[PDB]
mmCIF file of C-alpha atoms in Angstrom:
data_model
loop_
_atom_site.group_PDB
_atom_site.id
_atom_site.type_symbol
_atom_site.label_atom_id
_atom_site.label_comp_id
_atom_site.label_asym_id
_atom_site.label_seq_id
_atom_site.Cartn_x
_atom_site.Cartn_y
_atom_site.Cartn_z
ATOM 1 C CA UNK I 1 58.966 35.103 92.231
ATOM 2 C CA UNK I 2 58.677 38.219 90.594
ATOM 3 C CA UNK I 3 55.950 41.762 90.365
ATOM 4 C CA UNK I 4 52.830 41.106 89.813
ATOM 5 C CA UNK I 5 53.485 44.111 87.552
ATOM 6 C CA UNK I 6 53.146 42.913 84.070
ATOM 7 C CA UNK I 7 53.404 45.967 82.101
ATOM 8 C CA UNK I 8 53.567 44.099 78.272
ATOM 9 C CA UNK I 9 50.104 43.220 78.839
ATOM 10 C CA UNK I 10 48.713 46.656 80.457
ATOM 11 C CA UNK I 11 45.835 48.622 78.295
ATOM 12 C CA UNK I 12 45.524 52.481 78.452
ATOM 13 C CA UNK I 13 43.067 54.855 76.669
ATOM 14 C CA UNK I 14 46.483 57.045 76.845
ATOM 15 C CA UNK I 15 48.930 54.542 75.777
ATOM 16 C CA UNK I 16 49.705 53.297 72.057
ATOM 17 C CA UNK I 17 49.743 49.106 71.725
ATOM 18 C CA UNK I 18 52.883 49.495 70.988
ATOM 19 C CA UNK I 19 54.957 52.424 72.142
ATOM 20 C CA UNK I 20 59.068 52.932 72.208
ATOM 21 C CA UNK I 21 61.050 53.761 74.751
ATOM 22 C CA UNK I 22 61.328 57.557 75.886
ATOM 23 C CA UNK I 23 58.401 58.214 73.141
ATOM 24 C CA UNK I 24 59.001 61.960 72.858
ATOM 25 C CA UNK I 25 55.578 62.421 72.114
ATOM 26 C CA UNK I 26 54.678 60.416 75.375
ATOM 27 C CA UNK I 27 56.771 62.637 78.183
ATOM 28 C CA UNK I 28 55.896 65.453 76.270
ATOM 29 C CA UNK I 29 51.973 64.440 77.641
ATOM 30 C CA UNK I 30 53.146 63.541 80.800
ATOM 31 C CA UNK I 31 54.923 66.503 81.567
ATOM 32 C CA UNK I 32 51.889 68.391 80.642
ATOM 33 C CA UNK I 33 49.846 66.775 82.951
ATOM 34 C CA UNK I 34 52.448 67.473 86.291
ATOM 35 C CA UNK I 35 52.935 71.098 84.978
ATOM 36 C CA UNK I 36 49.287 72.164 84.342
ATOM 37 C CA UNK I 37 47.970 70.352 87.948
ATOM 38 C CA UNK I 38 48.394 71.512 91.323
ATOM 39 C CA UNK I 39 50.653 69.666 93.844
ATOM 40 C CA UNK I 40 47.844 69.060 96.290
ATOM 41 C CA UNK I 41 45.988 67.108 93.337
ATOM 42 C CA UNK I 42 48.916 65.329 92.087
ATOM 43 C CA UNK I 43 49.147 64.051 95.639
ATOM 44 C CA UNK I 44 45.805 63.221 96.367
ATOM 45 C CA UNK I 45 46.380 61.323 93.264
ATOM 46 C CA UNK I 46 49.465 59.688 93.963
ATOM 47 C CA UNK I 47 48.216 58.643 97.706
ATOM 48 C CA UNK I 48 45.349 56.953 96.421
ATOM 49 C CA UNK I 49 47.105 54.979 94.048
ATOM 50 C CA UNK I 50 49.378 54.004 96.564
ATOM 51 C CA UNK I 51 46.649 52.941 98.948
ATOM 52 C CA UNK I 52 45.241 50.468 96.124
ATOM 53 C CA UNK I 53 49.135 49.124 95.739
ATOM 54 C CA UNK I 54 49.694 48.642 99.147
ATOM 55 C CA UNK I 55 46.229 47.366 100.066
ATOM 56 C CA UNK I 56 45.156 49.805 102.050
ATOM 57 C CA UNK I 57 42.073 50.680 100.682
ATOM 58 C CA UNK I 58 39.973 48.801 97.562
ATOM 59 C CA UNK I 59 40.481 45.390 99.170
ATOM 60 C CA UNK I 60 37.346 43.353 97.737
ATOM 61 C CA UNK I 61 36.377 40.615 99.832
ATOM 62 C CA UNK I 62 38.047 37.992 97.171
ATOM 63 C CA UNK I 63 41.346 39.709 97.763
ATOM 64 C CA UNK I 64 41.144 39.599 102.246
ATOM 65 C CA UNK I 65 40.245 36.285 102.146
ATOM 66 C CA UNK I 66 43.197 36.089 99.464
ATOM 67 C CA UNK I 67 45.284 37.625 101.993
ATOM 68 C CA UNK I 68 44.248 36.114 105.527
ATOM 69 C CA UNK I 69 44.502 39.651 106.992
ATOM 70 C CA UNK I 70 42.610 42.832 106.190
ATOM 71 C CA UNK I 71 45.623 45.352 104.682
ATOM 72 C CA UNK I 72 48.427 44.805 102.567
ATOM 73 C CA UNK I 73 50.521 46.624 105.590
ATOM 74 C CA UNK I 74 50.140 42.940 107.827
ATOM 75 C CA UNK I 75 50.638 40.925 105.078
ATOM 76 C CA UNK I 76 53.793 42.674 104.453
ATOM 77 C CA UNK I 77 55.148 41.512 107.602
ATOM 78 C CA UNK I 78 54.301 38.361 106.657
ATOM 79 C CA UNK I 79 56.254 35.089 104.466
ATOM 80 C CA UNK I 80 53.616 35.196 102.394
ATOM 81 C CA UNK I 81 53.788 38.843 101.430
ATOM 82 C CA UNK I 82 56.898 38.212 99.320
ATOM 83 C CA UNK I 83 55.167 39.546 95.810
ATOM 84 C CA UNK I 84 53.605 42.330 97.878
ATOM 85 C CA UNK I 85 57.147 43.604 99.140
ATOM 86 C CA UNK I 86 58.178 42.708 95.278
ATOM 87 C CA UNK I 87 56.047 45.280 94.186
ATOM 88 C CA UNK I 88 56.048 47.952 96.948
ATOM 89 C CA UNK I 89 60.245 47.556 95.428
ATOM 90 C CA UNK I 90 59.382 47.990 91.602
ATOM 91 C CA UNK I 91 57.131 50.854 92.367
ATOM 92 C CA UNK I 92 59.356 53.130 94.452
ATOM 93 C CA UNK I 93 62.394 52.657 92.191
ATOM 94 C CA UNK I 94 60.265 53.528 88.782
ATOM 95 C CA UNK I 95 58.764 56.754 90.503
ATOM 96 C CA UNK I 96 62.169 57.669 91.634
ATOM 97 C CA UNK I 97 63.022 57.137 88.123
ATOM 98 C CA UNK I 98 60.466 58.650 86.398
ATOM 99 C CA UNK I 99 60.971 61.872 88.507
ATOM 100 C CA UNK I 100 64.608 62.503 87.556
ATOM 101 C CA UNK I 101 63.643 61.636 83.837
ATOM 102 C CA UNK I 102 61.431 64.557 84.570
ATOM 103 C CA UNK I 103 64.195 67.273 85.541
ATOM 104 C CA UNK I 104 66.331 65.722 83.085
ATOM 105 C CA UNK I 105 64.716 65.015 79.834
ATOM 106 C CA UNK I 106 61.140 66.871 80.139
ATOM 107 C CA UNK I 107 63.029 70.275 80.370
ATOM 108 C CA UNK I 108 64.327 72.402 78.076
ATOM 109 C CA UNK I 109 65.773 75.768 79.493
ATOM 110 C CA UNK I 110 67.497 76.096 83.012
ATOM 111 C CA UNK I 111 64.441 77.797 84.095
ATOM 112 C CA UNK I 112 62.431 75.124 83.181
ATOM 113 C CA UNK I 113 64.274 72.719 85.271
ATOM 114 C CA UNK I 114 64.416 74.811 87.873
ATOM 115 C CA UNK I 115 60.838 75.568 88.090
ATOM 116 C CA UNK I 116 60.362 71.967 87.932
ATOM 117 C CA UNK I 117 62.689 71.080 90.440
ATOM 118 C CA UNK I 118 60.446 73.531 93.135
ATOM 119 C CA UNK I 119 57.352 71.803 91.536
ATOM 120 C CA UNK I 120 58.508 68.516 92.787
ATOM 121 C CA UNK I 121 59.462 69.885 96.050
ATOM 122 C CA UNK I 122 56.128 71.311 96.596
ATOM 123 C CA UNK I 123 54.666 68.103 95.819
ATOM 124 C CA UNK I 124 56.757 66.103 97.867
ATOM 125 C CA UNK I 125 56.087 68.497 100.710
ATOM 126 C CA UNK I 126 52.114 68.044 100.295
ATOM 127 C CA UNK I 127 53.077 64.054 100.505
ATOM 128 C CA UNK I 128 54.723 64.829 103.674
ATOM 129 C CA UNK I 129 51.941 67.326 105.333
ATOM 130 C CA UNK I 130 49.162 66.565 103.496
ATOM 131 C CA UNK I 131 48.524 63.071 102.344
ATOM 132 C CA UNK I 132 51.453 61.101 104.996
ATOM 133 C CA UNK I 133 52.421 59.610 102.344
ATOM 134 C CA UNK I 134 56.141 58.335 103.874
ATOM 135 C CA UNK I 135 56.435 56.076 100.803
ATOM 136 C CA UNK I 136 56.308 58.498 97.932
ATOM 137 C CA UNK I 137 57.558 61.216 99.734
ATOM 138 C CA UNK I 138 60.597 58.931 99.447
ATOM 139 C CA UNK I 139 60.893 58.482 96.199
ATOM 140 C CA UNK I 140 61.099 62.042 95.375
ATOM 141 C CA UNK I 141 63.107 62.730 98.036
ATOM 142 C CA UNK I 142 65.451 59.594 96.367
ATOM 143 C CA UNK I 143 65.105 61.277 93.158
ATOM 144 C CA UNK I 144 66.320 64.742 94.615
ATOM 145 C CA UNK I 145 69.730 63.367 96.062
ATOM 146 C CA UNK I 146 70.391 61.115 92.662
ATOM 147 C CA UNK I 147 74.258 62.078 91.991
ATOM 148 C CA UNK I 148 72.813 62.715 88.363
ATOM 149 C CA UNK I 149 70.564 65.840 89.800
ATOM 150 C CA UNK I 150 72.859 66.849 92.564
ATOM 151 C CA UNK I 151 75.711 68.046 90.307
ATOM 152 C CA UNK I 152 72.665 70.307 88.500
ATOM 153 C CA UNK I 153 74.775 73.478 90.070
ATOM 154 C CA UNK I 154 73.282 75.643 87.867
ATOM 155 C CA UNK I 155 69.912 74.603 88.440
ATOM 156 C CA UNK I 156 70.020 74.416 92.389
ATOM 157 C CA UNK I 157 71.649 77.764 91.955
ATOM 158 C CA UNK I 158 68.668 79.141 89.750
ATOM 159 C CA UNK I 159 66.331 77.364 92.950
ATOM 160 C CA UNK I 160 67.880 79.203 95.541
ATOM 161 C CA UNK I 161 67.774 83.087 93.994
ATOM 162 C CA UNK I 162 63.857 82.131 92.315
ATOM 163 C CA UNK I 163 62.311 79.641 94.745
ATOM 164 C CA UNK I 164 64.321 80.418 97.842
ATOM 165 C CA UNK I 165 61.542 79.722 100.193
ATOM 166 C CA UNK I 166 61.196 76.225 98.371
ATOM 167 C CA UNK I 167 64.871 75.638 98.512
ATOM 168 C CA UNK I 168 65.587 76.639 101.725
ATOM 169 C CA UNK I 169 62.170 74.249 103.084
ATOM 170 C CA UNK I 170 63.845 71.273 101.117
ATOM 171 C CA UNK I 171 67.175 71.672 102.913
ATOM 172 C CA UNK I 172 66.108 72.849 105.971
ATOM 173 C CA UNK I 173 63.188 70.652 106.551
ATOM 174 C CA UNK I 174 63.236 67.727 104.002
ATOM 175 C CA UNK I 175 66.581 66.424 104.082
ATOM 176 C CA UNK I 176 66.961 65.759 107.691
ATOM 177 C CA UNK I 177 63.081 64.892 108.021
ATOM 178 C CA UNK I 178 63.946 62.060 105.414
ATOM 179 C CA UNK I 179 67.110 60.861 107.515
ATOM 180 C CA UNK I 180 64.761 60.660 110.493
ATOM 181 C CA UNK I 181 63.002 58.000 108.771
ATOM 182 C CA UNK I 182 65.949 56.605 106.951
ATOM 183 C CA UNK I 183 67.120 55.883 110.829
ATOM 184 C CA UNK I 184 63.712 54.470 111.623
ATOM 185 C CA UNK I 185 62.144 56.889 113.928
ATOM 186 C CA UNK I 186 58.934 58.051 111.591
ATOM 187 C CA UNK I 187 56.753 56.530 114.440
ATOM 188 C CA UNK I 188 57.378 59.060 116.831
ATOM 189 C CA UNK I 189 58.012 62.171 114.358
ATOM 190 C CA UNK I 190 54.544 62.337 112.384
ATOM 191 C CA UNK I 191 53.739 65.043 110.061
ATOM 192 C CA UNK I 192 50.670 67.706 110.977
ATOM 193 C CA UNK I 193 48.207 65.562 108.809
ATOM 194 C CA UNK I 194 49.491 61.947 110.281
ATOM 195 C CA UNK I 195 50.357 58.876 108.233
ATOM 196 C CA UNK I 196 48.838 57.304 105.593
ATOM 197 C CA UNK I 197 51.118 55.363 103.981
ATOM 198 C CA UNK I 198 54.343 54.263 105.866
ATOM 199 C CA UNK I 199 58.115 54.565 104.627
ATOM 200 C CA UNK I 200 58.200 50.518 103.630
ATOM 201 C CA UNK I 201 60.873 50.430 101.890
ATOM 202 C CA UNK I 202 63.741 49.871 104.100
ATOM 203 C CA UNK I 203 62.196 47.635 105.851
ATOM 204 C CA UNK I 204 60.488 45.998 102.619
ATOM 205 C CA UNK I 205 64.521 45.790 101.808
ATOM 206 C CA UNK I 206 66.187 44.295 104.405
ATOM 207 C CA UNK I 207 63.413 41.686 104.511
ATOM 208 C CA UNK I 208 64.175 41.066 100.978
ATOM 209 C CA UNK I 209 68.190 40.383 100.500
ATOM 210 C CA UNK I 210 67.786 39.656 96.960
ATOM 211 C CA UNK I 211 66.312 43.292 96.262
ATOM 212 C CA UNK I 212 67.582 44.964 93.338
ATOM 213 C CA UNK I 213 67.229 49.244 93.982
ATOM 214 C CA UNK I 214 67.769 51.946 91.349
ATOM 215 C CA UNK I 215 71.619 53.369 91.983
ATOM 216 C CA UNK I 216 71.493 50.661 94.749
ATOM 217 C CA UNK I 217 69.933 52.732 97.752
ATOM 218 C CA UNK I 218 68.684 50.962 100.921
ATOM 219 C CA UNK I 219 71.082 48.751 100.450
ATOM 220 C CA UNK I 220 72.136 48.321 104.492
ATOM 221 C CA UNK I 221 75.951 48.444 103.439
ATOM 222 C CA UNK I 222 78.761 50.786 105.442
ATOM 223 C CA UNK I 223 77.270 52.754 108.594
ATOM 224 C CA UNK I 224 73.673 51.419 108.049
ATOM 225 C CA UNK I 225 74.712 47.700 108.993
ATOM 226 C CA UNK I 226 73.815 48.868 112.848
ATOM 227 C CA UNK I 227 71.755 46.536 114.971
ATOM 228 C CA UNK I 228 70.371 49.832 115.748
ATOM 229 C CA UNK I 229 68.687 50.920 112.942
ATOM 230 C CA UNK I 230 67.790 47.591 112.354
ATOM 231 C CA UNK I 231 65.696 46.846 115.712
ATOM 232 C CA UNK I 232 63.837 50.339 115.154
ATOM 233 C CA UNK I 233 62.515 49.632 111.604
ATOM 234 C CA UNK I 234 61.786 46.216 112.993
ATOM 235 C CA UNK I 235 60.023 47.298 115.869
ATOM 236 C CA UNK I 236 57.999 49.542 113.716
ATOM 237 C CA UNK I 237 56.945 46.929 111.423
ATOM 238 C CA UNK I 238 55.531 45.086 114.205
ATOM 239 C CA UNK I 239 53.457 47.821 115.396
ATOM 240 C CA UNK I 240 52.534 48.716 111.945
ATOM 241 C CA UNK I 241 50.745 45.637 111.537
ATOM 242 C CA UNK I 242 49.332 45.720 114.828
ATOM 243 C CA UNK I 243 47.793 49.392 113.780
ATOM 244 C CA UNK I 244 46.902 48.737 110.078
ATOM 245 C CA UNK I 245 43.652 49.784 110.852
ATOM 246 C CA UNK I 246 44.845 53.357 111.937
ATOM 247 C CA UNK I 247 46.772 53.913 108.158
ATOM 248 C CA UNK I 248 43.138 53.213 106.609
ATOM 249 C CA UNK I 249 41.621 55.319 108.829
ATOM 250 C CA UNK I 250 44.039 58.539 107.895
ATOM 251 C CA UNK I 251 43.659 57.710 104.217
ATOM 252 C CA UNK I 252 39.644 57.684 103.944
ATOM 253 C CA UNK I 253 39.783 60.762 106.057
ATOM 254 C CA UNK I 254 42.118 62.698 103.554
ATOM 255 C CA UNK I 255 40.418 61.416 100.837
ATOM 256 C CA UNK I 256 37.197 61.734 101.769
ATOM 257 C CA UNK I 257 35.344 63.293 98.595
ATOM 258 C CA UNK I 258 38.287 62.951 96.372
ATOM 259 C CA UNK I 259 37.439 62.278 92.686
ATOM 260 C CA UNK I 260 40.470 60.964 90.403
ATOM 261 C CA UNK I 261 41.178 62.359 87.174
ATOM 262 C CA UNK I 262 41.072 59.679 84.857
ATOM 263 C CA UNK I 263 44.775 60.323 83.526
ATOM 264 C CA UNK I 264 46.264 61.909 86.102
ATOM 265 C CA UNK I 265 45.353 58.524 87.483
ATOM 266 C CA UNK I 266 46.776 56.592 85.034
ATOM 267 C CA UNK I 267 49.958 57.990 84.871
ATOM 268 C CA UNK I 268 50.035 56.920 88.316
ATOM 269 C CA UNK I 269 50.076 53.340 87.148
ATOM 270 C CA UNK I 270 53.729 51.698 88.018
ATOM 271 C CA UNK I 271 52.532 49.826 84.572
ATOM 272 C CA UNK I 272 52.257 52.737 82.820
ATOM 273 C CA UNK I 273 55.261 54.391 83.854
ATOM 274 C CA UNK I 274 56.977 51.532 83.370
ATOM 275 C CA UNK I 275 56.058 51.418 79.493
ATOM 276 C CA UNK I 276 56.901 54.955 79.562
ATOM 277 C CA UNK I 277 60.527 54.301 80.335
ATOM 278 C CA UNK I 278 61.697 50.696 79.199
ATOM 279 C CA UNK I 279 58.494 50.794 75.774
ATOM 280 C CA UNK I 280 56.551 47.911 75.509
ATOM 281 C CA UNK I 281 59.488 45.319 74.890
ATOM 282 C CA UNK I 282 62.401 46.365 77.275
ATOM 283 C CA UNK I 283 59.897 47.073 80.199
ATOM 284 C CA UNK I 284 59.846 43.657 80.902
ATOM 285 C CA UNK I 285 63.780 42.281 80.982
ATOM 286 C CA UNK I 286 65.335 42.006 84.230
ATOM 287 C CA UNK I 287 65.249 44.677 87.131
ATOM 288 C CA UNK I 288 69.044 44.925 86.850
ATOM 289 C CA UNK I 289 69.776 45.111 83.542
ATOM 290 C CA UNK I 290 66.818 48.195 83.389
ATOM 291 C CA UNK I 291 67.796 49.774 86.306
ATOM 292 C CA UNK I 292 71.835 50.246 84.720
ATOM 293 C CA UNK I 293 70.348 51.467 81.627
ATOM 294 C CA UNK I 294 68.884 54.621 83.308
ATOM 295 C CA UNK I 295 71.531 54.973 85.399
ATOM 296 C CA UNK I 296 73.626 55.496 82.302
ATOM 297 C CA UNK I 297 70.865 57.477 80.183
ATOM 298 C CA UNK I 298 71.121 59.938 83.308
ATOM 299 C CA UNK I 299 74.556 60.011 83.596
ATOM 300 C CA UNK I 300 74.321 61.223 80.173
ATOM 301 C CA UNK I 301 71.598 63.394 80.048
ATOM 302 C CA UNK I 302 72.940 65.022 83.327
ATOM 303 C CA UNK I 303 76.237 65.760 81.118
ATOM 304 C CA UNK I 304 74.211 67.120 78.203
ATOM 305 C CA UNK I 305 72.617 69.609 80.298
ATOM 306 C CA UNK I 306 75.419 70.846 82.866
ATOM 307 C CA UNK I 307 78.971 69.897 81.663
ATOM 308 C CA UNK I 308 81.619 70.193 83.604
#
């Protein structure tokens, strides 16, 4: 089938009935919001909404005995998890998207990207040590090694003599933290805080061979086709299922307390963002066609910015 995600029909208090594409007005808000809040609360913010989309917390009793199993994290081991694994896909690759539409179109000076660049870093950092949330973490990290934001020289340039503690945590740290899971080992390299939320989507991906991914990612082509990498994912799924229990357990106790900021948590909405990016016409035509039109918006936007 397709997402449940049906973003022409989503309602906002912070949305206009009918909004455009790129509103200016719109990022202009959203921005806001991400620069004026703290990376610990953007991720407290962005975990939670990811435990509701993955069913890991929230499940009423209508939805379980919807399910057959108590988490989202069994079912999506499951045949029946297909529009579950749908979804976990059309979230990941709009976050990852909405993040480089950040550093590329909600900037205005070098500086400014720059300073959001580190911003992002630091909030992908409390995903990773704070919240374990794998799965976002991800999609920043995705966003971050976009060919579009890689070629930024002046901007990574302007990170390392600025935020050189940042920039040197991100390459030092990050990157080969992220290719640990990429390979399928997060089981047995877990962050100081534990997990929350798993990685998913690799192994969301090659469970689904009809997966469309922003730029293509995940994609199991070249040196990932390994029986390998394969098995360990696999294996991990298995025991993820097994342990669902555990994830839940890590979430309530980081989020013990929390109280959402009614927003903040909006703009966590995969809806939302979606009618932020495609407006309230294009957000629902097909995942490929929407996917190539940011890839070339980027492209161009990246060229704007930082000729060469």
């Amino acid at each position: 089938t397709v997402s449940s995600f049906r973003p022409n029909e989503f309602e906002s208090k912070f949305l206009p009935p009918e909004n455009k594409p790129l509103e200016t007005a719109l990022l202009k808000r959203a921005k806001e919001l991400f620069t004026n809040n703290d990376p610990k609360v953007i991720a407290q913010h962005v975990l939670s909404m990811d435990c509701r989309v993955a069913r890991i917390l929230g499940v009423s009793e209508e939805m379980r005995r919807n399910m057959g199993v108590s988490s989202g994290l069994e079912l999506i081991t499951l045949p029946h998890g297909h529009q579950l694994r749908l979804d976990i896909i059309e979230r990941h690759n709009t976050m990852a998207i909405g993040i480089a539409v950040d550093i590329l179109g909600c900037t205005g000076t070098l500086e400014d990207r720059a300073a959001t660049l580190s911003k992002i870093i630091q909030v992908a950092v409390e995903l990773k040590d704070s919240m374990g949330d794998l799965y976002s973490f991800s999609a920043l990290m995705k966003a971050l090694e976009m060919p579009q934001i890689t070629r930024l020289e002046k901007t990574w340039t302007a990170l390392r003599h600025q935020y050189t503690q940042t920039a040197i945590l991100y390459e030092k740290q990050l990157k080969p933290f992220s290719k640990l899971l990429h390979e399928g080992r997060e089981s047995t390299c877990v962050p100081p805080n534990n997990v929350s939320v798993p990685l998913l989507m690799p192994l969301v991906t090659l469970m689904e061979r009809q997966a469309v991914t922003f730029e293509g990612t995940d994609m199991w082509e070249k040196n990932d086709q390994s029986c390998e990498i394969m098995l360990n994912h696999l294996a991990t799924a298995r025991f993820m299922a097994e342990a669902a229990d555990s994830y839940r357990m890590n979430a309530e106790r980081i989020l013990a307390g929390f109280q959402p900021d009614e927003e903040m948590n909006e703009i966590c909405k995969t809806e939302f963002q979606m009618r932020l990016l495609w407006g309230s016409k294009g957000a629902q035509v097909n995942q490929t066609e929407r996917y190539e039109k940011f890839n070339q918006i980027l492209t161009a936007l990246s060229r704007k910015l930082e000729p060469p």
